[PDB]
Point group: D5
Chain length 186, copies 10
């Protein structure tokens, strides 16, 4: 997988809150980012997943986390979808269009026989490093509560070097402090 690699440069158009904008890797520097890939606008599982993320978007911004949804549809199409679907209408984050497939291929996430991105989510830290990856099959929707838990764990590890977040970790739970003495003790 791409875990612990740096994201690649990119330049894409996007729809965001009634405007077209250009997003590049420069916009992700010094920020936590979620790249949220999905296969197709006007599809079935895709809107429900996007809406799930939109519900959590206030909480994400409070954590200093930006969201970029990505499909290989155009930004024109995202705009159209945003106004015709009640679910998509509530999205306030950037919807990136990736018709060249370049951004999707940067994340090695193309279904080459379809020209559509797989259901993959990448959590990316302020230095561009991928810290968490989730990929599901066409028929299996993701769950934003799991994303948030991973983001919080990722942020904690970043802010507390010498500590690691064990399984199931939530804020307030105990952490492990790697050391020679701890080796084989757990």
């Amino acid at each position: 997988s791409l875990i612990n690699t740096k994201i690649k440069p990119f330049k894409n158009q996007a729809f965001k809150n009634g405007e077209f904008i250009e997003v590049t890797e420069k916009d992700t520097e010094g920020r936590w980012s979620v790249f949220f890939f999905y296969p197709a606008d006007f599809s079935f599982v895709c809107p429900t997943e996007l809406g799930d993320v939109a519900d959590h978007y206030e909480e994400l911004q409070k954590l200093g986390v930006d969201v970029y949804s990505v499909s290989t549809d155009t930004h024109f199409t995202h705009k159209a979808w945003h106004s015709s679907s009640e679910t998509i209408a509530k999205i306030k984050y950037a919807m990136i269009g990736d018709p060249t497939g370049a951004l999707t291929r940067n994340f090695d996430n193309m279904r080459e026989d379809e020209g559509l991105a797989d259901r993959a989510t990448f959590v990316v830290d302020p230095q561009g490093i991928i810290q968490a990856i989730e990929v599901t099959a066409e028929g299996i929707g993701r769950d934003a509560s799991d994303l948030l838990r991973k983001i919080k764990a990722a942020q904690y590890v970043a802010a507390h070097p010498g500590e690691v977040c064990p399984a199931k970790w939530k804020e307030g739970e105990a952490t492990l402090a790697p050391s020679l003495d701890l080796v084989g003790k757990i």
Copy 2:
């Protein structure tokens, strides 16, 4: 990612319930499988994750799901760990040793500069197809409750073709029925 690809053949030794066994892809045919990679025996986050899975192991077997933990340590070392750690002692599933790294590389999951597998989990259906992927950074433990949700969603989609599991889906929740009419409606 490897989503929607078939697992590759493999042959590895493993520790399971006080015996050494050989596992191959043949043992996964006609079964649901979880391949649970982790970097190192006697490490810190690794045991807590393995223990998390062990807690759920009764529930997994009831779903007809087999678990294979995998590291690049040997099966000798797993056996040693199983008897010295209170957490590992409760593991009843197969602990695979992958010192050649072949099984880990089949899943594209090697940290090449370390000789250790990344924290990756792959859900594999009875036909050998990878249906769900999770990868976390060295410091971020996984959460077995998320795995189980994905397994159940994967099983539902398999058993109900023409239906897909939307975001957040749990047993008893409504599903989507892909069709022309539904396109753009959600």
Copy 3:
């Protein structure tokens, strides 16, 4: 150019009159076909061009000519557009989706830095041979009346070997009959 070459096999999904269908080269065998490429659903010149062809579609059908519009957008997106645009709403021909870009590249017609097709029109005879090609810049709309003229000239020449259609030819006008005697006399 691709003039006087045979079209390549293809297989694509399309939206046509409230249905999703599959189109392949077999659909075109024994028929006159127009492959009408455009860059983007929900864009600006594209709808006006497509509406213009729709205005001529009754006549095209009478002449045994099928129309396939093609963009790299999906057939889902074509369905959405067809319902939200009153121009696109009048289209009764197949709207092919080409998100893999394979059909577009068959016709050497991809804008590689955009992942969108150029404004190209190809007239294909029942033997799969390209008899006329028109390509215009992003800002320059095509004119279906000129397309109809070329289709009629191509059909005439197929039905009257030994005759060719001079500049500006329309039905009922003098043709040229190639021969040694005519050489250098015009």
Copy 4:
């Protein structure tokens, strides 16, 4: 196609209004140019097409447009044809000879089995960029009226960056102004 690409350097001899001259890409710089390819002097469709362009030549010169006709015949042969054909006698634009085929291959327009150019027309702007292409089969004459409409649209979009010309557009008719708000409305 070669749409939106820059023309290649060339150096060819030509006949123009009773004398032999050299033509190069430098002569096209800062001018609109039409490269009008045809297969063979003394043939049948070819003279009618060239004459049709000659009929429009005064109008073209008024638009700042130079015409270069091109075949793989020599400039000597063009001069002879210009003397013996009443149609060709009317030509006041440069008739380029391309016996090496290099100019023709620059425009990817050679019938390799014949050593003759296909019936292709390229509209080229002052910066050398190809803005419109037309190619027709051996038996299908072109129509200069369509050429002029395309040239005019090309000049209009060049002179009005923020506007595009919809289908059928001619002088005085409504243009489109691409914008976010116009996305999906036509």
Copy 5:
């Protein structure tokens, strides 16, 4: 040079006495042939050389010698030339058009930077072997009576093995009979 090599297969259109014909290497089999190459129809040089061959053509035909003039111009252009020039009008042999350059290149006689053939003449026997070659720069006339002399010599040696024709040989002159005793004797 190509002396004593066999001519290569070819298929070209020609103008011959008011008709268009196809010439291939099969037409040369069992015959003596002259391939008379020249650079360009309608050029500014008087075509005295072609005329000189025409003057001698009745005699060449009595000797069973076919003549093929060749340039890279088309057979259409040869027909027009034959109508326009009193000298060329004398030609009753085949005027081959070679716009692909393939026949010219078979004889390694292309000026690649001009797309025109050099001034070369090849004498070819009934088995397709080249028995004499002459190439000259412009203004250096190929004399048809020297061609005839060389043809008669070539026919004589073909009919009299064991004899060779010394310098200046013409019918009625002594020949040489290669032998050991003749070695060093002349």
Copy 6:
């Protein structure tokens, strides 16, 4: 063919009027030259051709034209031949030996399965450019009167470019 190309550098030994000399492309500069190839000393057609050129050599020299005969035999062998044949004894031009075949291959004129040059004649102008080429089969001797005619035409067009008779 090699028409309108520049001759290539070369360096060969030759026999000329009872001496051995070295000939190079520098000897040809500023002069008209005939390179007269033939297959073999002591052979049959070859002497009669060489003798024919010798008959015309005074005339050629008055036209400022040098002659170089060339075969793949050695200059030693040319000397021997010049002594033993009445025909070859008349030759006053240089007889170039080309045993490596390099001069012959410069003119793309080797019979590779024989190691002998073909019967080829090249007329080369003072700038080194090949202006006329004639090649005949093993059995067919050349005619120096045609060579002279061509040389004179070549000199004429060099002196008076584009005085080629117009087309009507």
Copy 7:
């Protein structure tokens, strides 16, 4: 074999006397070193061999000889083994972990189908040159007494150039002094 070649740079983690340290080739420069490879922690022959070297370690240290044991197991695993085995417990030298296999492959000593090192011992002088090599089959334990003999012979030869140690040589015994006179006399 690698005899009389220089060791390659390396960088590995090791367990040594309750600490994790880094070992590189720089640690070996200016020292005698024994690189003692074995296939697997918690295995059978490996502990007995390592204990045997430990029995000799006081003497090795007195002679200026360092020992590095190496397997492809991790340094974490070495720590665990050192605490659970009373044999391994007596080891005071560095136990190198080589999970990437790089150190093992430097010495061309990998069992590629197992990902474990072969039973190989390399004696390395202060200039990095390999002076003695022993390799035994999986089931065949080495004998440290023979290793000590070879180390002493190597040290002797380094300290007494012009002398060599004959078969079976131990300290205090006759050496050979190579010379022309000695040639063929033994």
Copy 8:
């Protein structure tokens, strides 16, 4: 190393007990073999090593072990050495000459700068498999006592599949029986 690999085919001349013979790999089949390489006849360490092996030769023959000494000198030179050296005179095993170096290169044992073999000993089982290797520097003589211990251990493990020989093992001493229960206990 070459440990656990099969020896390669060879064909060499040898001196043995007063006659010249051919030796091939076929002669080693079904026998234990020692290939005893050394750099040069008439040298210094070499004779003492060969004599040491000769001292053990009766014991080796009793164990069904054949010895082949090998240098890049010829069989002629071995015969001469066997006559003029009191040490070499004692040799009753085959002395192989390898002037092509092929046998030496089979065992990857050539000093390429010298054209002489290194001091390497290979123990080879009846199936052709190399079970023990020893290589020493130019100045360091080997010790046949260690050779015999290794041969005996090799024969023991061959004859007792389920047992391995620990460090220091000699006849009569405790072996190890690999098992799961023995993992980690030593």
Copy 9:
């Protein structure tokens, strides 16, 4: 060197006793052969060497040994030389012409910058195997008495293998 290798197939024209003949490797089968290369007809050392071999040719023929001299000159040239030189006129063995250089290159004996063969002699046994080789510089003539001695030794060891005097 080519020692102990089998000669390669070849086909050349030769002059022999007033006739032109074809020589191939088939002519050498079952016979002892000497291939005697030299650089150039009409030259200096070459005739004296060839004349020396001719002096010994009757003796060679009594030993069942054929001689083939070879240069890159033609067989026409050998005939001329055989007529004009008193030394060469004595030669009754075949004089092979090798203008393509193929026979010379079979014996790896070409001076590539000259197109002439080096002064090499090869003794070839009835099975085609090269048993002795001698090569000398341009300036150094060979000695047929040494050649005869070697041929006789070669015949002796062929007839009586391993009767080489023992080492003490």
Copy 10:
């Protein structure tokens, strides 16, 4: 052959009059040299040829000719041979050992399937050019008086440019002076 080529650099050990020395190409510079190759020391052939050269060595030294015998055996083996054979004991010139085969291959004189040199002798002048070569099969003696004759001839031509030595030449015999008049005269 290598006639008239320059010898290549080399560095070999030799036995010369009771000592070991190094010989390189620098030792040959400014000197006449004989490289006398032979297959094997201690072989069953009497070394009469080497003895014959020894017999003539005083004379060769007066002529400033150094002799180097060469085989692929070592200089150790040459020393032993020189002690064991009454014939070889007469040798006071350098006996080069060439176990790498490099000197032998410089002279293209290796029997690759034996690892032994062929029976070749090379005469080399002070500028390193090979002036005479002799190669014979076994039993065909190289005669030292023929070598001397060839050396004296080579020295004579070196001292008298413009003269060459005819067949059978010895001091006092006439030489030839290459000239034009001498061509064809002998």
